[PDB]
């Protein structure tokens, strides 16, 4: 991971839950173009940024939900994500399990 590359990670901190993104904005804050950063973000991540961002969008609920007592419902929006069956249906395959089996600990 370059700093380059790790700054950027700051900008889509703070718009995690915004739900129009602009990989524009993204290269802009690095004062770097899209082209450029994205093709060392994709080397120095090995994955797409659009991968990165739900992958840690996902393990950032899993990592809360199990230090909060919240509802799918809530926890959802720390996502960004407005639609609970939404957060429920990506992370079900996400793991292969539903979020309401995996925090059970039912088998």
Not at 47 to 63: G, M, N, P, T, Y
């Amino acid at each position: 991971m370059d700093n380059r590359v790790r700054e950027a990670c700051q900008y889509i901190s703070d718009h995690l839950a915004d739900s129009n993104f602009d990989i524009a904005s993204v290269a802009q804050h690095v004062c770097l173009s899209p082209s450029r950063l994205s093709h060392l973000f994709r080397q120095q991540l090995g994955i797409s940024v659009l991968s990165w961002r739900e992958d840690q969008r996902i393990s950032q609920a899993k990592l809360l939900l199990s230090t909060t007592r919240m509802p799918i419902a809530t926890v959802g929006r720390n996502v960004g994500f407005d639609d609970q069956l939404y957060f429920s249906r990506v992370f079900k395959k996400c793991t292969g399990a539903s979020p309401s089996e995996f925090r059970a600990g039912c088998e």
